[PDB]
Design a protein around this nucleic acid. Sequence first.
DNA 1: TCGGATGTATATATCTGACACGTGCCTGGAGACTAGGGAGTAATCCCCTTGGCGGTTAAAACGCGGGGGACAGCGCGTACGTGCGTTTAAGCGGTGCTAGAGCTGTCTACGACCAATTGAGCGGCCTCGGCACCGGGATTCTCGAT
DNA 2: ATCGAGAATCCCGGTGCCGAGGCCGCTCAATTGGTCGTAGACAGCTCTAGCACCGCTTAAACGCACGTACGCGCTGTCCCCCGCGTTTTAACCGCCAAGGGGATTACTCCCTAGTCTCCAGGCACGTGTCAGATATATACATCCGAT
Lengths: 147, 99, 99, 87, 94, 93, 95, 110, 109, 83, 80
Amino acid sequence: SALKRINKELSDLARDPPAQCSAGPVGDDMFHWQATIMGPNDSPYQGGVFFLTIHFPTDYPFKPPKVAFTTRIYHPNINSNGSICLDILRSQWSPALTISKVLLSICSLLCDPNPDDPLVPEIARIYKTDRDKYNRISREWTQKYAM
Amino acid sequence: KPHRYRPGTVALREIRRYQKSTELLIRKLPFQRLVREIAQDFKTDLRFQSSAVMALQEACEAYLVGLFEDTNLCAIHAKRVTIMPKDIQLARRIRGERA
Amino acid sequence: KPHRYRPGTVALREIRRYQKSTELLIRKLPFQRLVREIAQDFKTDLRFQSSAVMALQEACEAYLVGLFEDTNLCAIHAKRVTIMPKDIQLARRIRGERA
Amino acid sequence: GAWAHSRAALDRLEKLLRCSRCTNILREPVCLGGCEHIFCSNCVSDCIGTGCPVCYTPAWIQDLKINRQLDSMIQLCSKLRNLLHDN
Amino acid sequence: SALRVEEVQNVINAMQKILECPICLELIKEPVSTKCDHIFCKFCMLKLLNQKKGPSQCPLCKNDITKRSLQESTRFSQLVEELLKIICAFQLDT
Amino acid sequence: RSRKESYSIYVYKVLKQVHPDTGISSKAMGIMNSFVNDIFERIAGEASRLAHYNKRSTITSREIQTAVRLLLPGELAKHAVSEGTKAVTKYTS
Amino acid sequence: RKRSRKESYSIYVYKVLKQVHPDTGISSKAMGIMNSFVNDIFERIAGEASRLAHYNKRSTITSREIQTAVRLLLPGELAKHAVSEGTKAVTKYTS
Amino acid sequence: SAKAKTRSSRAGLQFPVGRVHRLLRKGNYSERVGAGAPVYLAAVLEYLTAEILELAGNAARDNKKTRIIPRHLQLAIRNDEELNKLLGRVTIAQGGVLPNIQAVLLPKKT
Amino acid sequence: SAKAKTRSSRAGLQFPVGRVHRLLRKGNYSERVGAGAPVYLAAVLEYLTAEILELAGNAARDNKKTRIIPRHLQLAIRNDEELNKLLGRVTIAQGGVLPNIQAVLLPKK
Amino acid sequence: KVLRDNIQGITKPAIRRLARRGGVKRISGLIYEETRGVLKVFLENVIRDAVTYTEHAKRKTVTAMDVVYALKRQGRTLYGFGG
Amino acid sequence: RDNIQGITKPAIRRLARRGGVKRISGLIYEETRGVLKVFLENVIRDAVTYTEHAKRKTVTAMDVVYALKRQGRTLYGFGG
DNA sequence: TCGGATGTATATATCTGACACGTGCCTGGAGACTAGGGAGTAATCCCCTTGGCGGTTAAAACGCGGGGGACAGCGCGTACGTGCGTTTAAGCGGTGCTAGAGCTGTCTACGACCAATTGAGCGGCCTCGGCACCGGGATTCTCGAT
DNA sequence: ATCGAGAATCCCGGTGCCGAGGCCGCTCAATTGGTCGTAGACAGCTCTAGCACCGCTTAAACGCACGTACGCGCTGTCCCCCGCGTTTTAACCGCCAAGGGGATTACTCCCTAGTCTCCAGGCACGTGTCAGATATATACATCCGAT
Ligand SMILES: [Zn+2]
Ligand SMILES: [Zn+2]
Ligand SMILES: [Zn+2]
């Protein structure tokens, strides 16, 4: 039934466009997903057209889906494989959420970076020490992989 | 060569069979004889209602089944799969039936 | 070199010491604080007689001592001398405190 | 005509949205838990000690939380009613 | 003119979003409330409850959901069929 | 002959309200009789010890209510008290 | 105002003590335990005899009911000796 | 409730209220039996019977039988949690047991 | 035996027979209380008390102490067999516990 | 009419079936004698009490209610045979 | 808050010694605190129920004794 | 991976007895009334519970070195599971007998109830001896050295 | 094997304190005497169910052979509790102060026991019929050897 849920989700996302982000399948295979987001200004990640690959379990929305970013992004958590240590995406996933919910939630997590649980050492360390140069380095990487 | 199931498969088949059903598992007449033998040592010339013997057999079978569950947990605790006399004795001691 | 008893001798000395005496083994004030904390979650603004707190501590210490005896038997059953979390869990299951 | 079908259709909704005491457009609806009954917050905050005045079911919760979903259906209905009157 | 009924469809678009399951995202099939007054379909609930051996967690706000704890509301079921009727008259008369 | 008392007719009534089609076998009816009798003894017995501890001499309703809070486990307790309170309120008025 | 009186089996246990050990005293905390023990045993026997008289549709707790309650409540050798003492006391009382 | 009808009906219950009153009087539980206790106790008993019968009916419908038998009662009581803790020591006649095999004994999956 | 005295001494015990009679009446155990029940019950209670006090007095003499304390009651109850079976669940406050070290834990040559 | 070695009438296959319902997969050869001894002790305790109720009513027939009362007082409450 | 931590590591070890335990794994201590808390909750829960029923505000020794009795942990020495 | 052999779930006719329902009646439940005592309410008092210093010091917390126990791996030889042919007795049905459970009637000896009364038992005071404590000395396990 | 140093434990004598055992005054619960309704003992009768027996069918118990999964012992490794010395935190104790509320007394009234009359709620009993057990026959899932 996760397939039927995502069909209505596509229909709901069709009848209601979200704020500067889009989604779609990976072709004609439904259990994977390709999406794009655009950079928010309340974050060091503006201007970066960010691809999101998403894999779903069979009992959506019971077990949580998983995501990956195809960009090497100067983020304290999002590694080179684009995976994010997100408790609401692995361990705290409530079956009432939907894809647009997590998309704006990660946009917020992009808006406010979290250096508490890191997966890449240098990004999070430079984040937790200096904000000006972190902003400088974050913006530079986003221009390279999006413009 | 004729067909033979490996040791242990039929045991699992029987577990599923007897946990699914509810019929009494001790033969009626031999159990009835045992009850009467024990009673004669307390008071001679007793008679039993037929329902009294059945009530005794229901209670006895339920007690032994419950005891075998606890015994199995003690065997698994010692990294064995075969229940042994020392497993029963430990279960009864902790239950408080023999202090 | 200074004197050192081998590991295990002092443990046996303490067993003999505490099985010989009867004084309470939990500190009075920390246990009293625990009782009051639990009670506030059931009903606010409760008071306790001093003898009521004493009765709770006597019962609690007697229960834990009895539980540790059963736990020791489970450890020895597995050919160990060190009690472990899985030993306590087995004892409580067979006693019927957690089904 | 003049959306007379809508008025009949709309009124059928509000006959389902009546206080079991106030019998009117129920404002700040609240259910005190333990039964199916919903009332107006004014007319039950007094009767919390005696329970539900229809079921006789005792009150289950001390406070009176206001159900947002039942809040939404009322304010939307008024806007729907106002728009359907073309004002 | 501007076909101001789009606001009417804006109103009806708001209708389902209060009267939709937050789990299986269908029309409320058979409503069931909770202590926290959250509404579901009692199939997505029993599909949520049987796989947990013990107290569960509310999908929206709170903790401690149990089969006994919930109760058959049947306050929105008749609301749901009303909403379809509200939509149905629209296409006939517009 | 001799006359016996039982909850047979009443248990069957409660059944036809929660499951209007399913019957109940004879042996199952015997088990329900024993269950009802057993729970009656527990609640009544616990209420009697309350009256004796508090030096009262009357099993009022609230004595039954405290006994129900003691015997039944957590979630069952919250429901049986509500059901009983509702019945007394409807009976009085 | 004067404090209400609280009954107890203190003096009777003390009499029984001085019969068995004519020189050994007993401390107050030990006295509370013996007092509580008598109360608990009285409750067990009495409650069992009540349940037992109600099974047979009787309305009287005779002495025979107490005898059967003792037989049901105590281990082997204790039951045998306690029944003997009870029967002795009742026959000495009535004669 | 103004009605001068049978006390069972006047309370809305199904269990008898006069009979419970008598059993509480003639039973030597106390000297005085208040007029509120039988209604309350009859209500509690009726509620518990409804619980067990509902669960048992579900199990019998699962096995495609339209008639509750002792096996269904055993299934209903043990699968639930609070009802199991209330009847922990009781043994239902003709009840069977709960089907479960310890995980260590199952064949060696790869 | 016929006499006009206290029912206790007439029965030859060391316990009240009147007090036990009143407790059996005002306890809701039954409607009527036979005239022979309190004597039987007082005798049984006295016998049990005598047993425990004899054993406890022995245990106190063993420790060279001339006055029973709770510790000695606990020893006399656990060491015996029938008494420990009768008071299996009871907990004696300030009672300690029997000295018992498992054999496997003991040192070895 | 005396009786002899009736407990041996509880056969090895019968004990095997009880263990199977308890979820036991493999059984040591020594279990059977241990189980017979355990079973006999249980019956003695119950029958002793049952007969004690029969004697009190001055009857010669042990009824089902007698057995039910004995099991109940041992904390092994039994449903299904009255009471 | 956090008053369960007052049952310190040496206190739990002393109780184990009285029970005849010679060697103790490091994880026992946290396990013991959890089991103890469950036991207290049950007794105190019953004790307060007696207190409320008597319309008192002080939990008496008799409240605790009655609560322990109905759970089959009969306690001698505090009345009853 | 793969085709056998085997046990299991499923579908269909059919036949029986257990279940659900109608009836007569009778005994227990409901209704009206009276009286008495148990419980609710008000006021008070003084017992004991909470709260707070401040000084001592027993006990908890921390760190460290190491040695003994937990645990995994291997192997060997016996105990036990599976299958089969044979022997035993359980199960069933039917029949006959009567021991004893169960119920009714009658009659009286036993226990409840009540008023007078008087001594056993409880509250309070007090004192001396049993026990706690401490200091010194004898001895007795324990460990490492051979 | 042993023996010697080092801690630990048991024994003994002197001192001091406070709680157990006994005495006394006094209230109130146990005892005595008489009366009276009825629970229970006992004889008699009925007839339900328990016991004994016998013959037949076949399901289950049993004794035996065989092969293999596993219980048990040995070895080796490493890591994690134990013993111990040092420092730091907070329990314990002796004391004082305030006032909450547990316990008690007096009063009043309304709630429940007891009684009588009346009638319908529920139970034993009898009867019809369909839910489920049975028996046959299939499809299908699973185990195991050999690839
Ligand atoms: Zn309501
Ligand atoms: Zn209202
Ligand atoms: Zn849903």
